[PDB]
Amino acid sequence: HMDPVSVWGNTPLATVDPEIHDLIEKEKRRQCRGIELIASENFTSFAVIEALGSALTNKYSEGMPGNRYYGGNEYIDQIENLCRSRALQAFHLDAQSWGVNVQPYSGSPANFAAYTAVLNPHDRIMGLDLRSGGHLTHGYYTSGGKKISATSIYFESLPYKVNSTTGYIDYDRLEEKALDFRPKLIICGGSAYPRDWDYKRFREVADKCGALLLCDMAHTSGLVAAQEVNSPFEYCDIVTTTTHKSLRGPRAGMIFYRKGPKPPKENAVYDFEDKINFAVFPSLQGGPHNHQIGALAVALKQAASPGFKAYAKQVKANAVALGKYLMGKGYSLVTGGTENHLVLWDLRPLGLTGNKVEKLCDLCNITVNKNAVFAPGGVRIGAPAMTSRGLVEKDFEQIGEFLHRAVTLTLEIQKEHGKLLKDFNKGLVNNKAIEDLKADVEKFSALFDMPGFLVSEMKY
Amino acid sequence: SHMDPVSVWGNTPLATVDPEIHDLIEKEKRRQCRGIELIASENFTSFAVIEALGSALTNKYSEGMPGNRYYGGNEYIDQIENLCRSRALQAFHLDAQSWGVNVQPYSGSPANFAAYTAVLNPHDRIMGLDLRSGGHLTHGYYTSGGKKISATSIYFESLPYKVNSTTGYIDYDRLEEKALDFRPKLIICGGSAYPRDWDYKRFREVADKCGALLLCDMAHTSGLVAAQEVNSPFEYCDIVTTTTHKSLRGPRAGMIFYRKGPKPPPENAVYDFEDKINFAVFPSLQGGPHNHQIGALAVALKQAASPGFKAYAKQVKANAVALGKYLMGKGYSLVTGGTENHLVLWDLRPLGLTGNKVEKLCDLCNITVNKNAVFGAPGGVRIGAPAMTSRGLVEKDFEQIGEFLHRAVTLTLEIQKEHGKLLKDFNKGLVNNKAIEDLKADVEKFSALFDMPGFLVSEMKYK
Amino acid sequence: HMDPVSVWGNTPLATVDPEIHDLIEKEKRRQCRGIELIASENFTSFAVIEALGSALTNKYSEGMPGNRYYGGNEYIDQIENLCRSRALQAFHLDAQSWGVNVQPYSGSPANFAAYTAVLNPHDRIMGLDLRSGGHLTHGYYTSGGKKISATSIYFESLPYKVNSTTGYIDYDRLEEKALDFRPKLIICGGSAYPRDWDYKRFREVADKCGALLLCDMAHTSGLVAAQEVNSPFEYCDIVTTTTHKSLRGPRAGMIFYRKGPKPPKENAVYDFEDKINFAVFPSLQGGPHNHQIGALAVALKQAASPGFKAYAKQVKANAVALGKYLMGKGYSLVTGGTENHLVLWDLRPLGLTGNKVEKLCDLCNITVNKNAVFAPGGVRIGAPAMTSRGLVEKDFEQIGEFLHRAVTLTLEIQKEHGKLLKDFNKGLVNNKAIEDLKADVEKFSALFDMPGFLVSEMKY
Amino acid sequence: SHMDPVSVWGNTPLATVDPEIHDLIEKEKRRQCRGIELIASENFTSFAVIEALGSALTNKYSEGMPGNRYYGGNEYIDQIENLCRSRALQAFHLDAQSWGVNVQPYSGSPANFAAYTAVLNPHDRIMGLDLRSGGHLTHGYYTSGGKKISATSIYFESLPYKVNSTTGYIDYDRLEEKALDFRPKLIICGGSAYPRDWDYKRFREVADKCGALLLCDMAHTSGLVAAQEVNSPFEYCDIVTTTTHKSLRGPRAGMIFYRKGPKPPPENAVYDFEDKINFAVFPSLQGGPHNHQIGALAVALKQAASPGFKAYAKQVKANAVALGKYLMGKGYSLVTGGTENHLVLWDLRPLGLTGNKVEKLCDLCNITVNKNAVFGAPGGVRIGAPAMTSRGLVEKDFEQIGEFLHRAVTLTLEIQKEHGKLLKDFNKGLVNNKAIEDLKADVEKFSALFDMPGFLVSEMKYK
Numbered sequence A, C: 001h002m003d004p005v006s007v008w009g010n011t012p013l014a015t016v017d018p019e020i021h022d023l024i025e026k027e028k029r030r031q032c033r034g035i036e037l038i039a040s041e042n043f044t045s046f047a048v049i050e051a052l053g054s055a056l057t058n059k060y061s062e063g064m065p066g067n068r069y070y071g072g073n074e075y076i077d078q079i080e081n082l083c084r085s086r087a088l089q090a091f092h093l094d095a096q097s098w099g100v101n102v103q104p105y106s107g108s109p110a111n112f113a114a115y116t117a118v119l120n121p122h123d124r125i126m127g128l129d130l131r132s133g134g135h136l137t138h139g140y141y142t143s144g145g146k147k148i149s150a151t152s153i154y155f156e157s158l159p160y161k162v163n164s165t166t167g168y169i170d171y172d173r174l175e176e177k178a179l180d181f182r183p184k185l186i187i188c189g190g191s192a193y194p195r196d197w198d199y200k201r202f203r204e205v206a207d208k209c210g211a212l213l214l215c216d217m218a219h220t221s222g223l224v225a226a227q228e229v230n231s232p233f234e235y236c237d238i239v240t241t242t243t244h245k246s247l248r249g250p251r252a253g254m255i256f257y258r259k260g261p262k263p264p265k266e267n268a269v270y271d272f273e274d275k276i277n278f279a280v281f282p283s284l285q286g287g288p289h290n291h292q293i294g295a296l297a298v299a300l301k302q303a304a305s306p307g308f309k310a311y312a313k314q315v316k317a318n319a320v321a322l323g324k325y326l327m328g329k330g331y332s333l334v335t336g337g338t339e340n341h342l343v344l345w346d347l348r349p350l351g352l353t354g355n356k357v358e359k360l361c362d363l364c365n366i367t368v369n370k371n372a373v374f375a376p377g378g379v380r381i382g383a384p385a386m387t388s389r390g391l392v393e394k395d396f397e398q399i400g401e402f403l404h405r406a407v408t409l410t411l412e413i414q415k416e417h418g419k420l421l422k423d424f425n426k427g428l429v430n431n432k433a434i435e436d437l438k439a440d441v442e443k444f445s446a447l448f449d450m451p452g453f454l455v456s457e458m459k460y
Numbered sequence B, D: 001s002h003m004d005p006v007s008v009w010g011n012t013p014l015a016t017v018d019p020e021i022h023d024l025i026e027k028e029k030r031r032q033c034r035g036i037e038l039i040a041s042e043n044f045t046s047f048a049v050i051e052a053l054g055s056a057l058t059n060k061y062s063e064g065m066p067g068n069r070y071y072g073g074n075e076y077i078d079q080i081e082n083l084c085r086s087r088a089l090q091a092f093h094l095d096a097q098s099w100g101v102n103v104q105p106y107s108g109s110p111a112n113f114a115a116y117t118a119v120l121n122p123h124d125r126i127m128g129l130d131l132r133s134g135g136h137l138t139h140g141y142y143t144s145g146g147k148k149i150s151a152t153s154i155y156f157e158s159l160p161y162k163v164n165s166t167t168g169y170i171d172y173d174r175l176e177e178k179a180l181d182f183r184p185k186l187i188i189c190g191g192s193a194y195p196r197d198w199d200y201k202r203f204r205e206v207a208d209k210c211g212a213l214l215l216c217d218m219a220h221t222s223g224l225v226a227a228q229e230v231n232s233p234f235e236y237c238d239i240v241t242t243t244t245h246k247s248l249r250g251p252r253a254g255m256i257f258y259r260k261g262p263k264p265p266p267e268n269a270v271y272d273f274e275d276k277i278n279f280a281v282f283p284s285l286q287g288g289p290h291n292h293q294i295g296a297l298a299v300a301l302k303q304a305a306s307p308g309f310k311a312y313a314k315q316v317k318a319n320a321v322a323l324g325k326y327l328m329g330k331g332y333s334l335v336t337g338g339t340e341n342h343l344v345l346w347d348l349r350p351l352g353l354t355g356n357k358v359e360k361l362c363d364l365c366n367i368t369v370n371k372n373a374v375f376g377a378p379g380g381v382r383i384g385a386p387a388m389t390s391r392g393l394v395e396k397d398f399e400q401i402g403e404f405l406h407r408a409v410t411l412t413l414e415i416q417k418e419h420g421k422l423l424k425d426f427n428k429g430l431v432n433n434k435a436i437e438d439l440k441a442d443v444e445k446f447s448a449l450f451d452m453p454g455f456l457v458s459e460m461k462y463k
């Protein structure tokens, strides 16, 4: 005998599965009694979450608006079209010059879909090296020559690097490598680069070697929407992005592509739109995740607001303020500052590896990540998440105090037990000094609001 | 200018922050329960799944595997994901020493393309059930004119096998013939519109004869598999990929199962799938997992192990059967003459109709079917029972669905005979057709008599 | 102190290196005191050999006539142009409709060069299966899936087969496989197919699936020159060939390609010529072997002669006569006859493998090769070489006697020692019956003239 | 109609069977010895090599390896080929337990492309000396515009390294930098117009640092290598490919050498090259061996181990040096300022001339050089000593060659200044130029004073 629809289909989660209910509540507390400094993380809005957990997940809508494989998409179409037009509006794009596909399941899929549209297998790609701040999806093989990223498995990648002493992109060595190697695609954009991008220069290099130019703006998408950093849309043929980082929406990706007539350089037009959409479906993805697309549409509307431009401005200023704080304490920052949402902290001068600081920090509910510079010798630290919780400059200056205390403890433990990791671990067991910091982090964290859910009704 | 307070942008309900989207979701809530959904790939998932899906799990970055993440703060995400992985084994009755699972694929197509990347180099050969015979795009697809459509045919080398051109069953003899000519590294079984069960043992026989891996993509029938109501592919397959949002009734995600442990006989060797598969998902293809999806999936998998889910699985079968026997009783033709799973494939060419015309008119009566190919424009339509069975429909109610479809096809032929075969002509008969209106209205009245999972009809804006 | 030019540069081979001199003399005797039935072998003319061993080997002439990379090619150019025009004349081709490149070093290179001109790596190719009579260069992988032929390593090949009971090409299963698999290139022509080729049908199949059609006529090239078999030039886009088989020239290859306007099927022309020449040089080969090209030009002139049409006619008739002889003794021929230079002898009916007959035959200076049918169950037997020595029908009927005696001895040994190869070997040691046959072969072989050198001045 | 008798078609000499070709060979015999051949890749081989080359060895089919042929009748071909293989090891002083050789390549480019197929999968990465810096097409070559020209760049993934842009030497630091960015599976050393020796130990250092195989293509300097007059690549390279018709003075063929036996230190492992290389030649790429070439090569290899060949090798070096020092003494510029092998590379841009104009005028005086690139139309010409040294020329005679070239370049500038830089203009000065005639005639008079290998001048038709 079948369970009545009420019993299995309508009963709240807290009853259907306490185990998972209880774990979600514990993660809810973790997100708001710690200090979240992972530069790729944010806290999204309750509205976005409601769209995300909606009946839109039940619908199959392979294809795209007006070219669907089967019917019943009368309202999905308005949602997707509404999502696409808000995407253009949030980045101030004329619709006669740009289009967007909002179906990619996430960032990595968007990237691989766009490659598939414009490149044949084994075509050459250049992206920012991982160790110089790049991303897996831009290409990565190891020193042994094992191909790690699918970009490196299905295409041929070669990375360009930052200057070995300044930490800035080396635009001359870039140009040099593009002309030896002759990539069909140059990727700009990164995961841990703390400075803005000279897209005009990348366009100078791409025209010199015959390449397409793609920007992957996942990290700074929110800053781009507020016109708070250089717009890659002025110079690139394609822009990919994530929607859950500085943009503060759901986890999803977007591909923006040029349309209309070519800037004279004959009398032809761009041919990206059909190749891009087709690469997404039917080539690479199945049915779009329409709950994600609804949520994104909500996030794109929020992202166009005056309140969101102030958020973007405040993200940059918080990162600067934390940056100037660390430097005033003697600490080294890659490029000696920041122009975007993150700072890159160089720990080799102190004799420390990124692993050791990130472990002790994690012990105090400060989440950072180890990260390469120029074992990883640094940590990446971002402003968006905590800024979304309403922290301003005085507050990030205090986060800086917390970090400074962590590294001190880290040096004191290294000074007492040794440089090897087996030795560093020995001084984490029942450290009364680490405890005192975890408590001070928790009390500081509880002074702030939290978007997405109500802290006044959570189980813990 | 100042920052918006957290309560204003971040806690305010969706209905205030964005009326337009709230409105459109409410309209689509109405469409889902005032019509008849018969897309074989569609289901209606539980409110408990949707609560996990719309949750704060979407803020966490957890690149990696439980226990081996890239950065910290994953104490509870590792628990949710491990719970999910252990429940995926339970729901399909797998010994934890012979099978593992990766639950990170964003969807079904990502799970397939990751599975291939793990066990194949680029351009390796693949065989899957042809699209025209009931297969799926991710199993390989180029057109007559040579154009490579599926990613699987772009980065690997595919060649399809077909059903018997007169009976509609998989032609197992011709499968073996092609696999020995072509020598694929991977054979795929499973499909999107195949109305019979699969002979996995036979597929294992062919894979062992030509030296291929055997992968079953069980997306469509995964819920029937969990309930042990169809043949299990785990008895014979090396890898089993699946979607979780069809007959499984979960969120939109995918999973990849792999054999692990010792192999029956090249000396005491063991399966090596585990590492290559997890690594193919991350870091090779995917980025951060979608943790809300993994929590929602963990919910669905627990629900999928409950005694009521077995009853649900039996019922979708019986509902598909009853509808099949009802249609044939009215004189219609079904590919292979019936069904043994969740769907029926309806051959319309005997009526001189295209699946196009039937799908269009049905949609105008709130009946969602999709046009579909038959062994030989699409000459059929595909019809599935999971969704409507999830709303409580039993056999008597699917015989009423069959009566509606009959009325629909009768409307279609009366339009064809009146205006012509041309699709220009056909559409003329769909304007102001009071006979269609009475059917759309008879459909909506039937539809309202049954409950609805996921939300509360008593709370909807449009009643 | 340098050796004078006379001492090292002009001294005859018999003095500079007796070892090699002596081995060449022993191979000279072997070629004219045996019975050479390898269908791919011939005996070429003294004139061709003189061109082959000429000062033309010292010249570097990268490029082609009138487009050379450097000078001094005033006479090489006339030789190559003379070679190309004789190539067209020997196969009755209008020069406004066909061109030829005569630079490929041999057959396999010609084939791989032509693939390279018209296909991209991994494009799909269909060729006659090896076991059905095809050639390595048309595509070959093993049952384990190891790629053997470079055609299978750098492109994707799938073989079409002969009918499992008649041994003829299965033109219906051919068409079926081309439409599933969709090759960009279909190869026709073979190494051991004893019947003519329905090129019109192959053209019907290639137009149905969008493929180029190439014929590899290496084995029957001489028969084509005499218009003694169907011309592939009526129906194919490209024809490759060897020049040392039935054509009786030096070891080298040629690529013929269509030129001029397309047969209407708009108003465009063929684009093979530049791609083909470019694939040969600079893509695949270095300097052409100008001694080979001189020799080929000599062979092409000989190949146009009335004496050579009679040779081609006589090759076919000899193979028929040997064919009808074996069959009159009860033996099975694949397709029950032959229309070209070879017969394929099916030995499974007698309970024998091709290995065993070819070993005993080799013991009597009868050279044949084991070969697959439909361990290999057959032997391939060709007429050209012995026909070039002037054997006519009565003489090949006698060769048939020799073969019949060999198989009898082979059955008698199998009947006495066993079916396994370890057992068959046991009865080859000091077999007085095999000796009597080797002697009868030698005395028969000495009754005939020999081209290429003078038997009246050889060391042995 | 009847068959021509064997004596008529098959035994009649070339001069009767085909006057046209006989005539043209005789004219080309005359060109070869009444001019000055300075193509660095050209030589004049011995009559004994040519007798093996034009022999009945061309009738035999011997697909396979000695001992492991496809069909019989190869008793003496296996002996010739084994003799040839053993002499190839002797001529380069290789221990038979550490090195093997395959002598079946039809030419140099086939030997290279077979070597790659044996040790690399398709699309694996390769680094070779750039064309513009002195490398060879088979080492990889795409143009600025992206066009893939070399087969090596079509089926594999190549990237060139370059000479130092001011000194002309290989830039070993930038080589190491690129190889660590690009991670090739194979590094190639050797070239076609590099005037210095190679630092194989350095190349081995880079290959070991980035984990690549190291192959030396020694085509140009193989004769100098056999004579131990330049650095041996066998000390450091895994595989050594070569042509046999340049400084080696053999027929047109190639060879591939491979290391075999134990490797110095991943535990007591051994080299695995032998099988993959022979199999790559046959059956993967080539068909029947050209046995006349293998016999002719066996002759050249014996001759190449004689004491006179060492004296010849020393002399080509000294001849190239003397010509280099003579040219510089007249004010000319040589890339890297001299030579340590068989050739000089002459930078003409300092005179405002293109290699085109010099090569054209030289050809009109029976002086064969080839235009060639320099570190930065080709701005240089390449000039080689092997050929003319083979005719007995020593230093005094190469200083006379230098005097002729000087006269040639002086004629060229006097034409440039008179008519202009335009190649339209330039050609105007080449018609009825009695100063060129006196130089063409002074050249032909010089040329006749020296003997000639391969044939007998006293027997030629055109004297």
Ligand SMILES: Cc1ncc(COP(=O)(O)O)c(CNCC(=O)O)c1O
Pocket: A060, A285, A286, A287, A288, B040, B041, B107, B108, B109, B110, B136, B138, B190, B191, B192, B217, B218, B219, B220, B243, B253
């Ligand atoms: C058999 C099969 N496998 C995989 C997938 C991929 O699912 P995703 O959309 O999650 O990528 C599908 C899609 N099923 C679509 C249909 O039959 O209507 C499928 O039918």
Ligand SMILES: Cc1ncc(COP(=O)(O)O)c(CNCC(=O)O)c1O
Pocket: A040, A106, A107, A108, A109, A135, A137, A189, A190, A191, A216, A217, A218, A219, A242, A251, A252, B061, B286, B287, B288, B289
């Ligand atoms: C620059 C960039 N591009 C794309 C992505 C892909 O995102 P998905 O997880 O949605 O696939 C990332 C991930 N950024 C992860 C981090 O920096 O921690 C990224 O940093």
Ligand SMILES: Cc1ncc(COP(=O)(O)O)c(CNCC(=O)O)c1O
Pocket: C060, C285, C286, C287, C288, D040, D041, D107, D108, D109, D110, D136, D138, D190, D191, D192, D217, D218, D219, D220, D243, D253
């Ligand atoms: C270094 C090098 N390697 C290989 C080859 C190939 O040789 P084949 O032509 O046999 O394929 C050449 C040709 N040398 C031509 C020149 O330098 O003028 C070469 O210079």
Ligand SMILES: Cc1ncc(COP(=O)(O)O)c(CNCC(=O)O)c1O
Pocket: C040, C106, C107, C108, C109, C135, C137, C189, C190, C191, C216, C217, C218, C219, C242, C251, C252, D061, D286, D287, D288, D289
């Ligand atoms: C049909 C065919 N095509 C091409 C070739 C290549 O020839 P080369 O050896 O010149 O590469 C062969 C060799 N025929 C060999 C045999 O049948 O014994 C052949 O049979």
